[PDB]
Amino acid sequence: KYGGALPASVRNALCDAEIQFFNEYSSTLARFQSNLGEGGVNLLLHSAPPKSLFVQVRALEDYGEFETSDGTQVQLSKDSLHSLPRQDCEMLIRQGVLELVH
C-alpha cells in the first residue's frame, strides 16, 4: 500500500517481533527484486493495465526540482499543474506528492 513503509500510528500498536518480521520481509523482497533482468524491477510499478502514456497531475507540496527519464527538468511547487510521463511520476503519486487530475 502507497509506498513501502509503516505509519507511526501502526508501528505504535506492534510488538518488537512484528517490527523485526517487517524488516526481514522487506529485505527479502528487495533482494528478490534485484535479480530480475540486469538492473532489477520495481514491482510497485505497472499495477494496472496502462491506459495512456502521459498523465495530468496537481502538485500538493513544494517538492522542488524533479527530472524526467529524458532529462527534462520540472519545478514541482504547491498548487501547480503538470503533464508528465506516467512511469516517471507513478512513485510520487503513490507517496502522496502528486494527485491525478480528471
Binding site: 526481514e24 520481509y25 528478490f32 514491482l43 505497472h46
Partner: protein, 203 residues
C-alpha cells in the same frame, strides 16, 4: 524462434497463471528474454537526437504493455508462494523426484526459503518458545485446492477423454469426451495435466 513468438506464448501463460488456483511450472525464461528486449529498445531510443515524432511514441507504448504483462505475472506467483511456503518446496522436490519439469526457478526457490525462515522467527519469538517440549513443532497446513472449479476451453485437436468424480456414486468416476472447440465448467484436477501441456485455455 522470434520475439514475436515469445510474446504470444507469454500472454497465454499469463492468462493460465491468473486463472489457475495453484502453482504452474515456471516460465521465467520468457520473462528474462522480454526484459532484455525492453532494455535493448530503450538504449536504441536513447541514441536518437529527435524524439518529438510518431515512431518513438509507438515504441514506448509497446514497451509499456510488455512491462505490464511481465510485472503482473511475477506478482501473481509471489502472492501464491506467500500463502504456504513449505508446501511449495515440498511440491518442487516431489516433481524433481518424479523427473518432471521445474515448479520453481532458482531465485523463486531462494525467496521461498528465506521467507519461510523469516515467518518462522515471529512464531518462535511470540508463542512456541513458551510451550511445553512436546508442543514445540511448527504447524504446516495441508493443501486446500480439492473442490475447485474452472471454466475451460479446448484448443488442441486430439485431446481425448477426461475422468471426473461421480456425484451419484462417489466410489467411482465418469468419463467425458472433449471435442476440439468446446467450453466446459469442470473441476480443475481433471484438466491439470492438459493445462500444463497447453491443450486447454482457462477462462
Amino acid at each position: 524462434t522470434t520475439p514475436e513468438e515469445v510474446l504470444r506464448k507469454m500472454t497465454a501463460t499469463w492468462q493460465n497463471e491468473l486463472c489457475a488456483p495453484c502453482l504452474l511450472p515456471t516460465q521465467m525464461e520468457l520473462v528474462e528474454i522480454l526484459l532484455d528486449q525492453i532494455q535493448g529498445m530503450e538504449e536504441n531510443i536513447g541514441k536518437q537526437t529527435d524524439k518529438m515524432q510518431l515512431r518513438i511514441s509507438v515504441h514506448r507504448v509497446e514497451l509499456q504493455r510488455i512491462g505490464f504483462i511481465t510485472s503482473d505475472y511475477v506478482r501473481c506467483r509471489l502472492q501464491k508462494i506467500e500463502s504456504n511456503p513449505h508446501d511449495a518446496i515440498d511440491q518442487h522436490k516431489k516433481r524433481k523426484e518424479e523427473g518432471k519439469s521445474d515448479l520453481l526457478s532458482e531465485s523463486e526457490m531462494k525467496f521461498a526459503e528465506e521467507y519461510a525462515l523469516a515467518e518462522s522467527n515471529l512464531f518462535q519469538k511470540t508463542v512456541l518458545e513458551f510451550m511445553p517440549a512436546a508442543l514445540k513443532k511448527m504447524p504446516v497446513p495441508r493443501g486446500d485446492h480439492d473442490d475447485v472449479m474452472v471454466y475451460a476451453k479446448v484448443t488442441s485437436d486430439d485431446v481425448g477423454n477426461v475422468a471426473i468424480p461421480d456425484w451419484q456414486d462417489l466410489n467411482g468416476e465418469v468419463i467425458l469426451e472433449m471435442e476440439p472447440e468446446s467450453c466446459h465448467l469442470i473441476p480443475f484436477e481433471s484438466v491439470h495435466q492438459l493445462v500444463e501441456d497447453g491443450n486447454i485455455q482457462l477462462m
